[PDB]
Write a protein that binds this DNA or RNA. Structure first.
Lengths: 96, 380, 61
RNA sequence: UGUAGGAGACCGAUAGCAAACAAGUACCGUGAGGGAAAGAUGAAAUAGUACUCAGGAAUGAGCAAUUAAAUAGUACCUGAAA
RNA sequence: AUACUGACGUGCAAAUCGUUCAUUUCAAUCACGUUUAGGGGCGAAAGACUAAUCGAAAAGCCUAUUAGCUGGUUAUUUUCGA
RNA sequence: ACAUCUCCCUAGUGCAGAUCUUGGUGGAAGUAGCAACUAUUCAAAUGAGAACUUUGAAGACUGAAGUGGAGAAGGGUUUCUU
RNA sequence: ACGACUUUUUUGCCUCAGGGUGCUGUAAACAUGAAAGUAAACUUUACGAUCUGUUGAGGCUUAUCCCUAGUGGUAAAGUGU
């Protein structure tokens, strides 16, 4: 089991869809990426992240989120996405 | 009774049914005819569309209103990595058409060629080609001799090297190229001599040449009749919509006549363009490939910031007058003209004067990054 | 589940349903409540709180 | 006609009183009024489905079990056609 | 309820929806109570309206009204036959 | 429970059709379609099972001509707890 | 439209980031700066649309833009013959 820190550009992913579904899609897209990446069918999306994504309201979700992924076990395996506040996105890359 | 006023029908009949093409790659329907006297030579060449630019050209043409001045013209860029020849094919004429007699292959074929005869190269055990390739040279000679004795047309099997391009795919494009020229023996000699080596565009064409271009059109999916055929819209008041034809035929005969256009597929059609003049044949090694006698600046053909959806040309390239069917990233097939061209155009010598290499992403202000940096000065 | 208790809480406080805060934990202790008297006890304890008004200012005016 | 008897070369549950059944009922109509559908296990349920197993539950299965008979299981006679 | 002869037109409705529009201190609007009943009532009059029913309401009866007209009008073989 | 052709009495007696009547049933068909009323998300609980049960956190709308309070006609136990 | 087609599956590809290219038009922040004037001290202190400086800045730029053997990734292993 492993711990990762990523930055997901929500703007590219969310690009297509209408205002009405925009913020929902950003939440949905987080669930999708985290499961696909970490190899679980189960992703728990922390309320803090949910609050941050919805903070500027339905028309425009934040452009970039720094998310922290946590492999947990006790089917059995799952992961929780947790949000990391940041001063600036610039110059941050993937890390383990 | 007769319709109240008369117009040409919308859209040509001559391309119906307007269904999707079988294949992404183009196909030559017919080759130039084999004039015996000329030496053996290639008739076609495969290339990738990179984008369009504009060019500035000085005009000789006398008695024209335009006359002496330089003019600005649209032009297409087709990247041409050198083709690799891999096989020789001999056809023979029968009342029931051309039938292939035999095919003779080279002693190696590269992975990029090999990938095309699979769907799943990664998953495969890559066992294709290896045991036929082995068989000894007497066998090859015997088949060649059989071909030599009877065949009436000889064609060469050529392929693209997609790794010498920026394109995503690695399954090469294979295409047959007919050889027109001398005796069957000479034709065979020329292909044998060529065989496993690589063939660049300069061997197949000449500056100022007139060329035929074969390419599959831009897709749009299924489009409405107005868009697909050009039909004039119905008035606004109309109850069940307006963007659709108002009759699809008379009462008799009691079927929908085919000629009336209906909604459906648009694009991804096969098309043969004729008679496009080649303005310049680039050289990969040259730094000055896009330079001119008027400009005298060191620069490559690839425009500022790269071609939209194609980026950086790196091999040899053709700068072709005007436009040619199909999208960015598409294969284009170049074909020699069916009859040698005798027009006042076909004789003409194009001394091109300037080639833009400014951006095609937004409205370009500079011809190079070096120019841009110089223009502004110190920045953060 | 907590419907009844929420309706009673509105009456006990003198305040709109929309403003009642029921602790999201210790829900069982709330669930046992079944009378206005029980709500008064819960309110005394800290397990039901009145939310503030959604704040609004004449300052700008 | 009301009520009581007795009858039949009468009808046999889409018939015959509208009505063999909790029928002038249900139901519909502001109202005057209009106004139905729907009978049958078996000899005996004082034989009406015990018990085990799989099921959250319905149910199912059984080496288990009432019956002469349960492909007679409460939609219970027979069980045509589409 | 004017226009869109717009939406819907196997409707969201046996007259609905959107936009546009006419109307607002008076020949104004609404509620409830009350009055007038079928060749009758009522009508700032369209043969309008009188409970989705109006150039004669709704209900039942006279009544299984009546129809030189339409449709239907049921096993076989055999004989003569318009 | 059923025949009767031995003879013969008797009749509500023989159906494909009547836009027949009544009851059942298909192809059309897993289709038309489930479109008004700005729009939801995350976590927790309950449970066999939760997009639309409950709770918290957000984000939203109604916006005192209100899906807020009261009341009238009509409805009639629709109320409440379990 | 769905199919279908085009691809790729570790000298790849996705992923961010840096660079390129543009697009917008000069961020926040601070100044005992400027600014129509204004008011109140026994020259100094208050308010102040706006403007200037640090500032061709800041922000955004592939989701169907370009480059990068730069970062971290790259599961399932089913099914038919």
């Amino acid at each position: 089991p492993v711990t990762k820190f990523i930055t997901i550009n929500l703007s590219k992913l969310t690009h297509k869809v209408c205002y009405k579904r925009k913020a929902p899609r950003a939440i949905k897209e987080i669930r999708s990426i985290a499961g696909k990446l970490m190899h679980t069918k189960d992703v728990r999306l922390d309320v803090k992240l949910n609050k941050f994504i919805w903070s500027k309201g339905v028309r425009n979700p934040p452009k970039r989120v720094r998310v922290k992924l946590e492999r947990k076990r006790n089917e059995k395996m799952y992961t929780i996405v947790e949000h990391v506040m940041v001063d600036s996105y610039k110059g941050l890359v993937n890390e383990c | 009774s007769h319709r109240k006023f008369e117009r040409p029908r919308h859209g040509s009949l001559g391309f119906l049914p307007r269904k999707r093409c079988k294949r992404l790659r183009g196909k030559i329907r017919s080759f130039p005819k084999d004039d015996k006297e000329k030496p053996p030579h290639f008739t076609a060449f495969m290339g990738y569309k990179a984008g369009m630019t504009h060019i500035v050209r000085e005009v000789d043409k006398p008695g024209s209103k335009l006359h002496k001045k330089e003019i600005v013209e649209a032009c297409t860029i087709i990247e041409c990595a050198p083709m690799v020849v891999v096989g020789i094919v001999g056809y023979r004429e029968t009342p029931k058409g051309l039938r292939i007699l035999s095919t003779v292959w080279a002693n190696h074929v590269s992975d990029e060629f090999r990938r095309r005869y699979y769907k799943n190269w990664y998953k495969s055990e890559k066992k294709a080609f290896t045991k036929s390739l082995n068989v000894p040279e007497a066998t090859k000679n015997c088949l060649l001799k059989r071909i030599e004795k009877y065949c009436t047309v000889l064609r060469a099997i050529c392929h693209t090297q997609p790794s010498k391009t920026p394109l995503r795919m690695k399954k090469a494009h294979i295409m047959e190229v007919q050889i027109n020229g001398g005796s069957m023996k000479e034709k065979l000699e020329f292909v044998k001599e060529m065989l496993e080596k690589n063939l660049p565009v300069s061997t197949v064409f000449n500056p100022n040449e007139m060329i035929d271009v074969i390419s599959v059109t831009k897709g749009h999916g299924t489009k409405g009749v107005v868009s697909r055929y050009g039909v004039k819209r119905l008035p606004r008041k109309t109850h069940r919509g307006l963007r659709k034809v108002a009759c699809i035929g008379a009462w008799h005969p009691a079927r929908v006549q085919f000629q009336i256009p209906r909604h459906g597929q648009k694009g991804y059609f096969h098309r043969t363009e004729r008679n496009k003049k080649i303005y310049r044949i680039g050289l990969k090694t040259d730094k000055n490939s896009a330079s001119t006698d008027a400009d005298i600046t060191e620069k490559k053909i690839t425009p500022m910031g790269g071609f939209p959806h194609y980026g950086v040309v790196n091999e040899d390239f053709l700068l072709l007058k005007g436009c040619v069917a199909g999208t960015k990233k598409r294969p284009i097939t170049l074909r020699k003209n069916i009859v040698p061209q005798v027009s006042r155009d076909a004789l003409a010598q194009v001394s091109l004067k300037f080639i833009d290499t400014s951006s095609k992403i937004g409205h370009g202000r500079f011809q190079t990054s070096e120019e841009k940096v110089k223009y502004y000065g110190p920045l953060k | 589940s907590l419907t009844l208790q929420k309706r009673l809480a509105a009456s006990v406080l003198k305040c709109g349903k929309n403003k009642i805060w029921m602790d999201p934990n210790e829900i069982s202790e709330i669930s046992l409540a079944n009378s206005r008297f029980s709500i008064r006890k819960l309110y005394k304890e800290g397990l039901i709180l009145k939310k503030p008004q959604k704040v609004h200012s004449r300052a700008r005016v």
